[PDB]
Design a protein around this ligand. Structure first.
Ligand code: LR1
Length: 468
């Protein structure tokens, strides 16, 4: 019971992909390896099916077609990621600027704009140049801040006379947690039999990412914003955290669970310090900001993008690690009753109203002037063994998105300033440590032949975008 007119004139509708998950052509056009190439190549057993982004779904050679398909759907904007390491093979400026890479993105952008579609660029989507990961530890070093700045500056200069939407980081929480606490994503550090320290590193990384982010924002504010008239922000991710009972302890547990996962970032970006509840528990294992760093972090974004997938109940809990540092046991079940229908993984639960509360929480708690839902979507088993006829009748995914948008509208109505919804993902693509065992897209892709055929949800969204 939700339509296009139910939303402001201002609102933007779109979908996204991200460089590693879509481009393929990992070793063409002089691209330099990312930690994710390396991860999947050296540690194939850490990928559900051994697969990798070598070809992914091959956007690098198929962009002209993909942009047709975007426009057949009516996409108002498309979010994509620049492979740091395709424009700068060795990460620093000294290693050179890859002109082939630089042409690709320009070709790609111009194609988008030639088609009425608004380009929207994430600077970092976890595909860090291996050359930097190796030289000084990647985000375990402060050295990452300036190199990131120089990358950032390069991109603004090179591409920005045509970009209005810059995002510095996607899901630093996921990047830092899965990467340095669970050892599950690149570089694979922290979890049992792995390499780092799951008690130390995730804090160091987030700490440097926020300083990277800072560096990039100022670079843009002071140097490009007035010229290119765009907006730079960051994209965070969170589950909604519901109190299991309605005793105190469970309300504190929600406050802590959100502090640790969201506040880990929003707080610095607000008051210039990590959440009280993180200082309490993490103590001297949490880095301090210098006087000057705190100050310059306050309101250091033009917008907050949010990736929501699901909600969980929380409660007080009973080896040191980020993982267990918020002191909260999480569960999908209240009295064996699941919080929402359980999708393929076991993990995504369809909870439309969690996006409502999450969006309200962020406005209310962190006073964010501008919010976008940057990533919303549902998972689907990659069932080999059924005809495409059947696979594309993803009735449920249409329904998933409606209920979601309906919760977004309700957030706008009750005060919250959301300006955009971006389906994830436009295309079925490579899903990190799960590789190709599942699908998120409104556009089916055959992982072998790369052929693209629209699902029903795509045809729904085409109508929905076109209502008023
Ligand atoms: O499906 C996860 C999507 C990826 O495709 C995108 O790269 C990323 O923005 C998004 N992460 C969502 C997510 C993040 C953490 C966990 Br645990 C489960 C899901």
């Amino acid at each position: 019971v939700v339509h296009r007119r139910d939303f402001p004139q201002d609102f933007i509708f779109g979908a996204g992909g991200s460089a590693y998950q879509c481009e393929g052509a990992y070793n063409e056009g002089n691209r330099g390896p990312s930690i994710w190439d390396t991860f999947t190549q050296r540690s194939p057993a850490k990928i559900s099916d051994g697969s990798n982004g070598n070809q992914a779904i091959n956007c690098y050679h198929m962009y002209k077609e993909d942009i047709k398909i975007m426009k057949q759907t009516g996409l108002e904007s498309y979010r994509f990621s620049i492979s740091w390491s395709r424009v700068l093979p060795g990460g620093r400026l000294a290693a050179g600027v890859n002109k082939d890479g630089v042409k690709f993105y320009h070709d790609f952008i111009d194609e988008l704009l030639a088609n009425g579609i608004k380009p929207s660029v994430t600077l970092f989507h976890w595909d860090l140049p291996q050359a930097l990961e190796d030289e000084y530890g990647g985000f375990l070093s402060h050295r990452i801040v300036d190199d990131f700045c120089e990358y950032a500056e390069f991109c603004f200069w090179e591409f920005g006379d045509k970009i209005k939407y810059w995002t510095t980081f996607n899901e630093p929480h996921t990047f830092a947690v899965n990467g340095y606490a669970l050892g599950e994503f690149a570089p694979g550090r922290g979890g049992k039999g792995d390499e780092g320290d799951p008690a130390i590193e995730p804090y160091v990384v987030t700490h440097n990412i926020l300083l990277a982010h800072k560096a990039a924002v100022e670079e843009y504010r002071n140097k490009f914003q007035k010229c290119q008239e765009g907006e730079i922000g960051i994209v965070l991710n969170s589950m909604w955290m519901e109190p299991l009972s309605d005793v105190q302890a469970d309300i504190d547990a929600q406050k802590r669970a959100l502090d640790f996962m969201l506040g880990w970032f929003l707080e610095p970006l607000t008051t210039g310090d990590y959440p009280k509840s993180m200082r309490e528990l993490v103590k001297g294992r949490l880095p301090k900001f210098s006087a000057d760093d705190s100050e310059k972090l306050k309101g250091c974004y033009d917008f907050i993008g949010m990736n929501y997938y699901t909600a969980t109940y929380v409660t007080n809990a009973v080896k040191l690690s980020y993982e267990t540092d918020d002191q909260v046991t999480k569960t999908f079940e209240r009295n064996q009753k699941p919080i929402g229908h359980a999708l393929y993984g076991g993990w995504q639960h369809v909870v439309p109203w969690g996006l409502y509360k999450l969006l309200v929480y962020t406005k209310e708690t962190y006073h964010v002037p501008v919010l976008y839902v940057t990533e919303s979507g549902m998972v689907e088993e990659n069932k080999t063994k059924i005809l495409l006829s059947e696979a594309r009748r993803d009735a449920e995914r249409t329904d998933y998105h409606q209920k979601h948008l309906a919760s977004v509208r309700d957030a706008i109505d009750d005060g919250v300033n959301v300006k955009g919804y971006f389906v994830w993902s436009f295309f079925d693509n490579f899903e990190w440590n799960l590789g190709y065992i599942c699908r998120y897209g409104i556009i089916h892709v055959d992982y072998k032949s790369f052929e693209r055929y629209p699902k029903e949800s795509a045809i729904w969204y085409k109508n929905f975008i076109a209502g008023k």
